[PDB]
């Protein structure tokens, strides 16, 4: 009725702070893993060159 309640009440602030920091860390890790992937596609000049060769030019 007296002791354990008081010590729990004393614990609350530090635990709240640490859990907030942990959530911020999770969000930071989520953001840090985001990279924009620039894809590379076959240049159409080679396609045009192959078209010309097929014409026997």
């Amino acid at each position: 009725d007296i002791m354990v309640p008081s010590f729990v009440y004393n614990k609350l602030p530090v635990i709240h702070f640490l859990q907030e920091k942990r959530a911020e860390q999770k969000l930071r890790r989520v953001l840090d893993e985001t990279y924009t992937e620039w894809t590379e596609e076959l240049d159409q000049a080679h396609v045009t060159d192959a078209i010309t060769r097929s014409l026997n030019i």
């Binding site: 076959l42 240049d43 080679h46 060159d49 192959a50 060769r53 097929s54 026997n56």
Partner: protein
């Protein structure tokens, strides 16, 4: 009963009709004449275009049909022919050089080209050994575009020939063509890499000599005749009939071709 397979590759209908009339009138109906697009034996191909299923494109100077201008000349021109795909599809001769520029993998195509060159090289060295020449002349177009197909062609042809023990001399297209038309007695055996220009050179030599029939060696193993003009087609048919086992008919066709090139059918 027997069958002769006619292949058409860029040939005008007049030449095909002339060939059909010649065979029908000379053979007399004993051997039927069917038309197709690919064959391995008993086949005559009409037209400049290369048919599907041929890996070697040898041509010689037959003694009987020597033109008076080119009397006594003896030179064998063998053109290496890579496998031919459908007209829409990209040909190997062009794929082998464009895919490398585009970065695409070129392993299977290289393997196929290597096999074709080895077979063509083996044919060329066999002809050179039979004729007794010690050195053969490789012909490669020196254009920057064909900087990969020719490189493989040289790397393989020289390797096989040197393994056989003969010498190889590399040259371009213009110099060899001029030499072959003007002074052909200085060349015994000339191999040609697979390019459009080389094909035209082979046709020009086959025509300037007086009109001859080119021999195509196919993948299945065999020899098929090839012509592009009335006289050349007539000679090709005569050789084909000779192969079937007809001597008198072959001689008659050859004589008719020698006398009346453009109207052999009526001449005989």
């Amino acid at each position: 009963s027997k069958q002769l397979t006619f292949i058409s590759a860029g040939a005008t209908a007049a030449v095909l009709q002339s060939a059909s009339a010649i065979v029908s009138k000379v053979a007399g109906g004993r051997v039927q004449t069917k038309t197709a697009k690919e064959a391995g034996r008993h086949a005559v191909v009409v037209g400049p275009e290369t048919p599907i299923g041929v890996h070697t494109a040898v041509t010689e100077v037959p003694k009987s049909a020597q033109d008076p201008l080119f009397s006594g000349v003896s030179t064998v021109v063998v053109r290496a022919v890579l496998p031919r795909a459908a007209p829409d599809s990209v040909q190997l001769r062009d794929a082998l050089d464009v895919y490398a520029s585009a970065g695409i993998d070129t392993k299977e195509e290289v393997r196929s080209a290597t096999e074709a060159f080895k077979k063509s090289a083996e044919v060329a060295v066999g002809k050179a050994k039979a004729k007794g020449v010690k050195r053969i002349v490789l012909v490669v177009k020196q254009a920057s575009k064909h900087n990969c197909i020719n490189e493989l062609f040289k790397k393989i042809s020289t390797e096989t020939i040197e393994s056989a023990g003969l010498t190889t001399e590399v040259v371009g297209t213009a110099a060899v063509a001029n030499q072959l038309i003007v002074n052909p007695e200085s060349l015994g055996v000339v191999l040609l890499n697979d390019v459009a220009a080389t094909e035209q050179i082979e046709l020009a030599f086959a025509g300037v000599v007086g009109g001859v029939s080119r021999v195509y060696h196919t993948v299945e193993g065999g020899k098929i005749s090839a012509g592009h003009s009335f006289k050349s087609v007539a000679l090709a048919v005569a050789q084909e009939l000779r192969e079937l086992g007809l001597s008198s008919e072959a001689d008659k066709v050859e004589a008719a071709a020698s006398k009346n090139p453009r109207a052999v059918v009526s001449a005989l």
